[PDB]
């Protein structure tokens with residue numbers, strides 16, 4: 001059904017599915033800075049799952065594939081969200097309304113400053129491009145559907161069907177982006193130049209996620225933890 | 236400047252800059268040796284990429300340091316298209332999945348490379364499109380991690396050249412006879428694959444580093 005949605009409907013649904021902005025939890029002695037960060041991410045994860053289900057076409061996939069996509073994309077989704085809310089805070093990262101950190105504070109945290117700077121640069125880029133909220137939610141949906149699609153275990157009929165569907169929805173979101181741009185008044189040439197610029201940023205977002213993984217790895221398996229939350233009962 | 240070249244001139248310039256396919260001369264030794272010799276050639280190819288030499292020396296170095304493994308990998312995946320289930324590291328070094336199990340932590344990357352190659356096969360990726368994507372990788376990968384006056388000029392240059400390569404890719408597709416819708420969708424599909432390639436490179440770097 002998600003494939004019958006119009007651009008405007010696609011956009012509406014995504015806007016409607018946006019997760020809440022959470023707060024860091026502390027008494028303004030129980031955790032370090034990185035603890036505040038991981039705790040925050042843990043809580044957002046729960047909500048990310050609710051968002052994912054509301055993304056057109058996601059719930060049509062098997063439980064296995066849904067989990068695989070999220071396990072592959074969760075840090076990219078958190079990061080693009082952080083970059084989006086950091087846009088109006090040059091030099092700073094709004095991890096939470098009560099956890100606005102600047103570059104110097106990311107040094108306190110062993111080996112996080114590289115990622116910090118990359119996240120800052122991405123935020124500047126978004127600002128510089130006049131990234132619209134509508135384009136932002138499309139991008140986040142593309143990350144969710146595209147990040148793990150290239151690494152699906154089996155290659156059985158069911159899996160092939162799944163990949164066909166994922167790609168169809170991805171082409172859909174592509175049309176929605178082009179549509180928005182056409183509406184904003186861009187020329188065809190300007191439309192494809194901007195689509196390209198936007199999609200190229202996701203490559204840097206993937207890179208930042210990988211470096212975040214390492215940093216996190218350095219210091220229950222997420223698949224089972226995700227599965228647990230995605231696999232709900234109807235009681 | 237590169238910024239004045241037409242779509243056909245860009246294509247022509249990229250095709251002509253194409254590096255040669257090298258031959259393998261115990262596995263990692265052969266793979267690393269092959270990679271090491273390809274790097275000499277990659278650098279020359281890079282200097283032929285329109286716009287690239289206009290950048291400072293430090294920035295050229297920065298872009299190559301950042302993109303070199305992705306560039307090797309997309310080359311690898313391209314010459315492996317017509318060999319489903321196999322990775323053609325060199326015409327005399329064509330390996331399968333089972334052969335990757337040999338080395339620790341290689342199979343996972345192998346499988347990703349194989350999946351990427353299959354994707355290119357399924358999309359019927361053309362060589363004109365391939366040289367554009369490879370050039371996009373070179374100019375895009377490290378640009379995000381170069382706030383000075385010079386930095387502004389550099390990123391502006393890179394982004395204008397990228398817009399040029401984008402017009403070139405769309406042009407190619409237009410001639411191919413795709414509808415506007417099909418061009419946009421195909422451009423997107425190709426660019427989204429670049430993120431998977433970035434991912435393989437990072438895992439490839441972790442691998443190298445552990446040895």
Ligand SMILES: Oc1ccc([C@@H]2Oc3ccc(O)cc3[C@@H]3CC(F)(F)C[C@@H]32)cc1
Nearest residue numbers: 037038041078079082112115212215216
């Ligand atoms: O909504 C968000 C909530 C938290 C974050 C944080 O981002 C960074 C960035 C650099 C770094 O070195 C560590 C982290 C931690 C570790 C984590 F759990 F992976 C993600 C955390 C990001 C978005």
Ligand SMILES: Oc1ccc([C@@H]2Oc3ccc(O)cc3[C@@H]3CC(F)(F)C[C@@H]32)cc1
Nearest residue numbers: 266267269270307308311341344439442
């Ligand atoms: O043109 C090419 C020449 C060589 C390759 C190899 O690809 C892989 C793939 C998986 C892996 O685990 C190791 C490697 C080695 C290590 C390296 F130096 F990074 C690149 C090498 C690829 C393309």
